[PDB]
């Protein structure tokens, strides 16, 4: 029997299938819907559930996080769950934790909020007077693609100077029978021991089964690998497995305690006794204060860890370097290894047998002269799996410099933890100086003889780590050796935060099922140029659940594959895990072709002019020729691609609900698809999980095949994808490949400017030039090019098909001419600075375009920052710095931002809505914009308000539709809020002009009576409001128009810290200043500002797509996908907004941001740009540098050459194809 | 429209309604149920007037529509609905009439 | 502006659906706020002429 | 094919209400009792103004 609690109500569950997991339990079976399916993999955060369970012994309860998408249901016999919808509830009395999340505007999209506060939540119980360190411990492992996190530690600064556990759980744990625990099912089969004795049993029964504590290294395994365990084991509360113990070999610990465990004992252990006993404690600590999150290290242990054999391990080097033992214990009796390379190598001499359980792990303490260090590097600050790692520790004794033990291991270079034997056998004898590190780096170089083929790439870059940490490690031991010897501009909450913070929000996927429904999935091509001659679908059409395997042959791939991730064929079946089992194994024979294409370099026009270059490059002083790469990026939405299709059964009516950011798309795809006229097709949306782009044309073939299921069967199909196939379906930006020539004078003026742009545009023969186009425009923010030729063109590839992105190609256009001006100001001998300031546009101008432009806003801005963030003192202090510092680089950098606002047709930007007025004072107001984060309901609610004089309370909008609001746009450009604004304008004035005699004839009343005499003498009350959009116009045989409405101006400065040795980099302070006029909400402003400041640092530091050869890309493993954290923000980020200018045709003179401040985030990015340089001005090189993007640490390493680069194996380029491109 | 049916036959007539005045065939227009979110409100359906007060207020809504779409088909002898619709799609006129 | 009605059609309603339909549904409604689940109601013909 | 009010799918977890009607034309009410009528099996609650 299961017998557990959720939220303080029992469950029991009997005759299981152990294989299903617990959150796809507790929204499809239990409905406490308000925890969010992000990852599936742990990486996310989005479903922290907090997880009570009592010990009878100690007569205390442990509270503890955890991510209930790897949590097994068989795990919880005895645990109190508690989510979301516990705490607090919008009935009830609300917790002060979702009251002060709402109140300090912490919640955008309101997909993230819950995990956060309940994370928040499980600390203040643990935690009743906390610092602000540990509320940032606790929220390390959550994920927020939109907030950017600055109200969520906002909110968390006032914390800084009930629930009840179940009685029924405390009784049955204090009575505890010795009850082995079987749970049976067709396939799998999961034993769980109580006593310690019938685990030994069931170990030394078939061996093959794990031994399941935290899931979190088997998850993995059996979902994307998709490995099968027949029978599983999962210990329960043991107390051998779990003791931590003092003795004079140091101390010992269970390999059933959690990494959060041992990190608090050794923590609490490093303050008792001197420090000369302890340094591999404080290795650990060092490590352990570092891992995933307070999630993963409150569900992993120590035994898990070590017995994984995973590469990146994080604390197996600092155990095989500090003589640890691993204690045994089996039927056949008792046992203690020692762990070494011997013990990692798979070899079968030194490891555990198919039986022995690893009982405990003894750590000694650490002698008297000698010092353990450990060092990691990583993609990420916090929460990345590192590329290189490294345990390291040097005992000496009495009192000289001879080396009588060294131990260093490096784990993340090879297939495991390799540790250095030969030169460690060689090391032994001299002293602790310089030429103890040539010998030791001359045989760690072709000791450790890594090759083209090592997987994850960045071969040079662990080569240059290793001797990094050796150096590092020399530095710090010689230093402790030296030692010793009208609601309008009113802030606002959001509508939904509360129904946020709350779980109240309804997603595509929260809504209920619907009778004899379906599930469908796909399968998807993984060749790149590939014919197919034949698939075999005999074995998987017979299976539970399959109705038929949809094919290309009655949209999908027909006889060749000219993209990995193209759609093939889809599958129909009665559930979701047997609908993605039965796709698991259909078989396609294929045959690869030739010609295959990957990259732009060997792969119509679009062309702007501006004056003529020739004339000045015959005149002007200094040529230069320049280039850069640009690589793409992915959108990663949390909410994924949900959406159901609901068949009426009569006149062939269609019910589409999808998350879409575009539903006439959807709707007219399933017309032409079904052969229906456009009628009877109708589409739902009520709100979208932060839809940042993409969400259109996959999801429009998407809904296509849907719906052809659901109308082909005639029964409802639901269909929601995951992270991984969400990522291989669905492109993102175009990256772009530029080239320049350009000329400018000794006064460091450009006066002469060629552009050939290239795009990397994907397998679609007919595609989306518009960026191309519409990126050409956009290229100079701010700076007067008296010469412009400029051209672009699109280049095909076989790859999935790339879209836009929030930003929309002015970051990418954008920085390629900030690079040719920083390499410009960089060949002349003066500061960017004053090559931007002499170069920047004048208060009036002419864009190339010809289109007027005034911008003393601009100048305005650019003082304001310049004086009132003390820039020179700042500057002369880095300098200062520089000049007392050799390892540790700072950067400081400025960078304006012109962005324009605008469409491409006259269609484009007409906008309708629909309003009703009841008997009562109370309106309901519908549009045919889309929420998905912005807060444009709110913005809307505030529009109403200030229309009709009525308070806020008495307006309620009830999502959106196509048939109230038909023929609708798309929800993009950042400017739907505007138009859909004024849309509701247009409504609401005609309602205020239908009724002047009624209000005019009653002073004091309510809106109650007016609408009641309103309907008594026979006045409409329902109107259409419609806007018919800026008119907009571009030529491009001329290239000559009026395509932008207006443009924001902003500034940027950025201070950031990178060290040379470990290529990693800091942000301190960011001072942002934009122009807006009089903002709608304040609150809502500066929120966009933070997100899509976080989106454009990101863009440009992090985020990297990792391509296998033949096209395949990687999702998972030491090459992954990696957002921005919550570490990653500036310490101090002091933005301050500039009084208004009451602008012509802006609503309400309020300026469109959400693509705005993407491209202020190079700021940061040019910063280290400046650090960089300064290395290599102490260098005494000045040779040439070509800084790309994004810049990884690995080329932000590279840049910063040194004569450990000087002594690094060079591979011959053609002898492998490594793992990327 | 705000008035319900329940079998004499009122939204047959209202199809004839805007078959006739929108020049369109019977087959081209369609009708899903009464609501109080599109149609607000609306009155009760008794005393034999219900049908012939939403024929008027059809014909007004159509009426407001043919005359937007007046300079359309006064620019196209020969136009399919779909043609007339795309184009004033085109030069932003609205298609959603309240009667 | 929170309550939407529904009606896609009536079987042969030949007047009288209105007060005590609307007695009817008041408290099916506050059955169904109370108890946060749809409640679904059908009357017998001896209830009906009743 | 023609949906009517109880031709539509089964809703999640909807319950169902059925009314207990008066008999006596005028009288008096003294007292209820519902013992038997709340314990028996499916019952969720019952709606009384007592
Ligand atoms: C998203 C993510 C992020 C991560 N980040 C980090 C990080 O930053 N740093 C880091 O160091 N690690 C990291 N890891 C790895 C993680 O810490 C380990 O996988 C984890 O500690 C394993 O513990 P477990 O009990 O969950 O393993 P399990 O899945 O329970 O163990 C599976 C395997 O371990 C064996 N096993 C487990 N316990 C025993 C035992 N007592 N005796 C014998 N065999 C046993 C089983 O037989 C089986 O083969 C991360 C993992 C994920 C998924
Ligand atoms: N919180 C949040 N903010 C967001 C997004 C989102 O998904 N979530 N999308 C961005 C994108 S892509 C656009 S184009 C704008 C559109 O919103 P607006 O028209 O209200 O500016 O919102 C931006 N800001
Ligand atoms: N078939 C049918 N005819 C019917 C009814 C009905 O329910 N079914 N109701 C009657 C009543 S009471 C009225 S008032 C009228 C209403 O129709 P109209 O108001 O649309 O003219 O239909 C009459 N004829
Ligand atoms: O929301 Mo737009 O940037 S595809
Ligand atoms: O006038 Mo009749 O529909 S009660
Ligand atoms: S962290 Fe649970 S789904 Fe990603
Ligand atoms: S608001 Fe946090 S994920 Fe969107």
Redesign the pocket.
Known sequence: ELLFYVNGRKVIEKNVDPETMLLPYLRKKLRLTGTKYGCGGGGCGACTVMISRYNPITKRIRHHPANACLIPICSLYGAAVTTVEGIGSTHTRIHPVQERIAKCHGT??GFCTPGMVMSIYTLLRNHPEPTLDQLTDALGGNLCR?TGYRPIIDACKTFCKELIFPPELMIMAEKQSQRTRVFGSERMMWFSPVTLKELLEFKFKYPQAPVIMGNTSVGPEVKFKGVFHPVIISPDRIEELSVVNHAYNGLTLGAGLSLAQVKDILADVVQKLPEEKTQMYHALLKHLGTLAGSQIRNMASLGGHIISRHPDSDLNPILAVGNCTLNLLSKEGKRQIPLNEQFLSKCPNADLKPQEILVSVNIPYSRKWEFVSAFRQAQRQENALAIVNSGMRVFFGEGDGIIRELCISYGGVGPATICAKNSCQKLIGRHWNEQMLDIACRLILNEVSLLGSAPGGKVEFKRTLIISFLFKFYLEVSQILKKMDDPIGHPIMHLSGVKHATGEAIYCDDMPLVDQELFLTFVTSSRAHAKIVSIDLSEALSMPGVVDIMTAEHFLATDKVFCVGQLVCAVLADSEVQAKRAAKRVKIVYQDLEPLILTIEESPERKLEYGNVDEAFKVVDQILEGEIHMGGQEHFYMETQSMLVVPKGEDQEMDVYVSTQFPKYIQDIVASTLKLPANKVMCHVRRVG????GKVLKTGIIAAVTAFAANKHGRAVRCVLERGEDMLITGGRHPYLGKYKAGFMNDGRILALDMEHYSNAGASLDESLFVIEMGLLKMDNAYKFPNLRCRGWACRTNLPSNTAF?GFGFPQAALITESCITEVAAKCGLSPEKVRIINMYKEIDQTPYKQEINAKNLIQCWRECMAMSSYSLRKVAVEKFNAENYWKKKGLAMVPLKFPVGLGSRAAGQAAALVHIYLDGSVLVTHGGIE???G?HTKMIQVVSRELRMPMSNVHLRGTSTETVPNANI???????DLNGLAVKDACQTLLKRLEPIISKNPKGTWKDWAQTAFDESINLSAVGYFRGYESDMNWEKGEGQPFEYFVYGAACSEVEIDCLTGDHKNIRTDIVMDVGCSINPAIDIG?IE?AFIQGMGLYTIEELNYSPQGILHTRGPDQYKIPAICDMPTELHIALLPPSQNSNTLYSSK????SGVFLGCSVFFAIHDAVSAARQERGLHGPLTLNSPLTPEKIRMACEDKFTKMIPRDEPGSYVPWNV
Do not use: H, P
């Open positions: 955008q999209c939109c932060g839809a940042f782009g929030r998905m984060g912005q444009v929800s993009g450009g950042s400017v739907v809020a966009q997100g469109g941001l959400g693509e």
